[PDB]
Amino acid sequence: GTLFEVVKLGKSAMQSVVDDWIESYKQDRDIALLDLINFFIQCSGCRGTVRIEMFRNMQNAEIIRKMTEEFDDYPLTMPGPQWKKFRSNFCEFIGVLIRQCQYSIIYDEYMMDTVISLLTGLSDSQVRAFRHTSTLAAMKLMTALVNVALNLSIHQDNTQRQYEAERNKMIGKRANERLELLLQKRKELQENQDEIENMMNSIFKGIFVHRYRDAIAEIRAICIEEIGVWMKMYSDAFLNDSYLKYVGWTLHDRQGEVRLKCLKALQSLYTNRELFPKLELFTNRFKDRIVSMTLDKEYDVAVEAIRLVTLILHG
Ligand SMILES: Oc1ccc(CN2CCc3ccccc3C2)cc1
């Protein structure tokens, strides 16, 4: 509306285009997801675009096979001022998209299934551009879902404290309407969390477990950096010896870039004197590798290995 109104209300270009996308999704899921599919294609620097007939009739396999041929150096590698902010923008887009869809659309069983299947399929592509773009997207997607799970948790606690106060207040008395709504609230929220845990599994088992050992070092780095993020954000779910084995296995990586990320991830965990108990078995299992990297060969890896070891020491 007015200039005062538009300024006080600092919706970015990205927040605006996600509000519009949601409005379009509510008119026609199909055209909205086609646009979202084309976005991920254009983001890879692919010069083709999916039409509504392909979307409705073709499997992701066929779509990706047909877009594989329409390939001429992709946005995420470009140097130049006009692509400086692209990576940062791409990542922000995905958090804004999902933050905004987090209360309804995400739980419709069509939007997230479409995106994740497309990302999974692109992550199995021979084309570097496709693997790099889809994995980075899926890794930020996962983090966006973890933030949703954290928001659900808060509500799940307030629903549980309210359900208690009302269950106590009754006792001997017939279960009234307030108690039935809260007992129905509490099921819905836990059913929401199951669905989040589900999308996180599809992304983890479909993309992460394959991409973290990718041929391309930047893709390996992207995976390691992000599992470190899930392990700090949501400790009860991701900070365990099955997920940690991925980080430890990758300490042995051939590239500084990737060894560096493994150490930055473990640094963020070991600083918190609280999940320090949950790293005991991990510390016994990989103390030898960690301690060896203090003299790594790449200066900056050594500096980080040394910083990690002093963290472990002080705990
Ligand atoms: O994001 C989360 C991931 C896992 C859990 C739940 N735990 C226990 C349930 C379960 C069942 C079978 C195998 C593994 C698991 C995982 C909670 C949150």
PDB file of C-alpha atoms in Angstrom, residues 139 208 211-213 218-231 243-251 253 257-266:
ATOM      1  CA  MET A 139      20.622 -30.218   3.355  1.00  0.00           C
ATOM      2  CA  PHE A 208      22.730 -37.710   2.861  1.00  0.00           C
ATOM      3  CA  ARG A 211      26.137 -37.700  -0.990  1.00  0.00           C
ATOM      4  CA  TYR A 212      28.482 -37.458   2.046  1.00  0.00           C
ATOM      5  CA  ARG A 213      30.871 -39.870   0.166  1.00  0.00           C
ATOM      6  CA  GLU A 218      32.225 -29.516  -2.093  1.00  0.00           C
ATOM      7  CA  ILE A 219      29.220 -31.967  -1.892  1.00  0.00           C
ATOM      8  CA  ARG A 220      31.026 -33.977   0.859  1.00  0.00           C
ATOM      9  CA  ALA A 221      31.676 -30.669   2.727  1.00  0.00           C
ATOM     10  CA  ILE A 222      28.002 -29.607   2.418  1.00  0.00           C
ATOM     11  CA  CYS A 223      26.747 -32.890   3.980  1.00  0.00           C
ATOM     12  CA  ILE A 224      29.260 -32.846   6.897  1.00  0.00           C
ATOM     13  CA  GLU A 225      28.650 -29.171   7.677  1.00  0.00           C
ATOM     14  CA  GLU A 226      24.877 -29.751   7.872  1.00  0.00           C
ATOM     15  CA  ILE A 227      24.805 -33.001   9.954  1.00  0.00           C
ATOM     16  CA  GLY A 228      26.876 -30.947  12.431  1.00  0.00           C
ATOM     17  CA  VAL A 229      24.090 -28.374  12.358  1.00  0.00           C
ATOM     18  CA  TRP A 230      21.339 -31.080  12.995  1.00  0.00           C
ATOM     19  CA  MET A 231      23.456 -32.653  15.814  1.00  0.00           C
ATOM     20  CA  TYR A 243      24.884 -40.481  12.864  1.00  0.00           C
ATOM     21  CA  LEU A 244      28.328 -39.612  14.498  1.00  0.00           C
ATOM     22  CA  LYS A 245      29.986 -42.555  12.592  1.00  0.00           C
ATOM     23  CA  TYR A 246      29.445 -40.447   9.381  1.00  0.00           C
ATOM     24  CA  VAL A 247      31.509 -37.512  10.815  1.00  0.00           C
ATOM     25  CA  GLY A 248      34.301 -39.765  12.207  1.00  0.00           C
ATOM     26  CA  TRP A 249      34.459 -41.835   8.957  1.00  0.00           C
ATOM     27  CA  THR A 250      35.012 -38.475   7.130  1.00  0.00           C
ATOM     28  CA  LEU A 251      37.888 -37.269   9.440  1.00  0.00           C
ATOM     29  CA  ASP A 253      38.835 -37.551   4.019  1.00  0.00           C
ATOM     30  CA  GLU A 257      38.061 -28.411   3.004  1.00  0.00           C
ATOM     31  CA  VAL A 258      36.194 -31.593   4.276  1.00  0.00           C
ATOM     32  CA  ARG A 259      38.531 -32.486   7.186  1.00  0.00           C
ATOM     33  CA  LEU A 260      38.104 -28.810   8.227  1.00  0.00           C
ATOM     34  CA  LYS A 261      34.277 -29.099   8.225  1.00  0.00           C
ATOM     35  CA  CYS A 262      34.298 -32.394  10.284  1.00  0.00           C
ATOM     36  CA  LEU A 263      36.329 -30.529  12.994  1.00  0.00           C
ATOM     37  CA  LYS A 264      34.122 -27.364  12.946  1.00  0.00           C
ATOM     38  CA  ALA A 265      31.081 -29.694  13.485  1.00  0.00           C
ATOM     39  CA  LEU A 266      32.657 -31.587  16.429  1.00  0.00           C
TER      40      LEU A 266
END
